């Protein structure tokens, strides 16, 4: 009951999903061979949310792996925890998109998506009571950015009342790996804002900064970044998979976080995070957890909260702790930073308490924040987009596969409208 299915596309999405499944399997006590060997009853209490039970008593994740290139597919098959996935759920093309949004959304995506939509329909009709969808992808890569958003459109068309989650890694200016990146970033955003119920943004530069300063690691890697993202992702459904004093689900989060229909772009963060040297010098308390939570350096995004005002924020607490302490800390921080909080909604912080902390920690915190400072990323992306589009550079690849400049103009106009309407409420006063 109220289970969710997982679908991942693109190389970055596949890596994120693989590490997320590793983390979830470790937390639920499922071995890589799919056999249950947990130590507590609460481990198996609500296993139906993410897994399916087959004959013989083994568990398989309800994950659907999509791509146009078989390289990363074979890599994740041969990697660790690659035996959990059902071999049928692997669907892939044979050509690839070549970082081209047009190629991934009109030429090969349209002909390939029939089978993956069939398997998605199979899983959705097989599950008892669907709660929602969650999707991991990136907005820089062509195949992910195109096929994922087309599949979001189709899934929203076919299942209107369910929830859709997307954990998307948006482009960063300082850490760039693609030259046509702003184009398909804007094209993805235009389609995503229309259909996606929630959107969560991650930055590679933000992850690098976090791991270098807070964690003080000399040689970070994609494994570490994926581990951070996976922990932050599992923090959301912790309260759905475990009991607590104030339980809260995805619909609760959506209602309490989204004031207006198109203002649904959030930034996340995880706490506590300490280096190995300072591991024993810290004391785990609600005040210090909230301090690290509201620290701007802990955000998974390059956007600075001091450049905007918070609309709403949420804090999911894991572990055994008193409710009065959490409530008093929330009120104290909201009163102390009143200038940084929007004033026409009182008590714009939601707190949830769960009684099961992550394995190895007595306490932990997940933060989801909707603040006006997120417009900066769209501003930079649109600046790059218009700078390249004024010269029509690299445009023949997109124009030679069915599209024309009017679609680009419409996408730019929609992004600008989103930025303007999102900035309006920052200076709107009561």
């Amino acid at each position: 009951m109220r289970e969710i299915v997982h679908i991942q596309g693109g190389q970055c999405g596949n890596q994120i999903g693989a590490k997320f499944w590793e983390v979830i399997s470790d937390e639920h006590g499922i071995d890589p061979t799919g056999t249950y060997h947990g130590d507590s009853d609460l481990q198996l209490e609500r296993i139906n949310v993410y897994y399916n039970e087959a004959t013989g008593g083994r568990y398989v994740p309800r994950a659907i792996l999509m791509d146009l290139e078989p390289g990363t597919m074979d890599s994740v098959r041969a990697g660790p925890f690659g035996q959990l996935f059902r071999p049928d759920n692997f669907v892939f093309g044979q050509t690839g998109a070549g970082n081209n949004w047009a190629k991934g959304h009109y030429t090969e995506g349209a002909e390939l998506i029939d089978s993956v939509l069939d398997v998605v329909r199979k899983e959705a009709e097989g599950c008892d009571c669907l709660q929602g969808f969650q999707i991991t992808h990136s907005l820089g890569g062509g195949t992910g950015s195109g096929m994922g958003t087309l599949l979001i459109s189709k899934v929203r068309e076919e299942y209107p009342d369910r929830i859709m989650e997307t954990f998307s890694v948006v482009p960063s200016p300082k850490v760039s790996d693609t030259v046509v990146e702003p184009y398909n970033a804007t094209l993805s955003v235009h389609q995503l804002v229309e259909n996606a119920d929630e959107c969560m943004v991650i930055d590679n530069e933000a992850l690098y900064d976090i791991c270098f300063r807070t964690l003080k690691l000399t040689t970070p890697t994609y494994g570490d970044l994926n581990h951070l993202v996976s922990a932050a992702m599992s923090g959301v459904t912790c309260c759905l998979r475990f009991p607590g004093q104030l339980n809260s689900d995805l619909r609760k989060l959506a209602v309490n976080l989204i004031p207006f229909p198109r203002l649904h772009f959030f930034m996340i963060g995880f706490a506590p995070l300490t280096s190995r040297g300072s591991q024993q010098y810290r004391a785990l308390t609600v005040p210090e957890l909230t301090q690290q939570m509201f620290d701007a350096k802990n955000m998974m995004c390059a956007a600075d909260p001091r450049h905007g005002r918070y609309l709403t924020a949420s804090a999911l607490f894991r572990g055994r702790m008193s409710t009065k302490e959490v409530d008093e800390q929330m009120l104290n921080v909201q009163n102390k930073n009143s200038s940084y909080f929007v004033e026409w909604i009182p008590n714009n912080i939601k707190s949830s308490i769960c009684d099961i902390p992550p394995k190895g920690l007595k306490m932990a915190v997940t933060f989801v924040g909707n603040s006006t400072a997120i417009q900066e990323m769209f501003k930079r992306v649109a600046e790059q987009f218009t700078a390249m589009f004024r010269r029509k550079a690299f445009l023949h690849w997109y124009t030679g596969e069915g599209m024309d400049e009017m679609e680009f103009t419409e996408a730019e106009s929609n992004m600008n409208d989103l930025v303007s309407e999102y900035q309006q409420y920052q200076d709107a006063t009561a």
Binding site: D74, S75, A78, G79
Partner: peptide, 27 residues
Amino acid sequence: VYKVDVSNAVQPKDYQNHTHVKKPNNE
């Protein structure tokens, strides 16, 4: 030049072992 440079540069060796990259208690 070709015979002395390319033809007889390699030997049966350098092919033998070729491997590349694969895919608390207290209380």
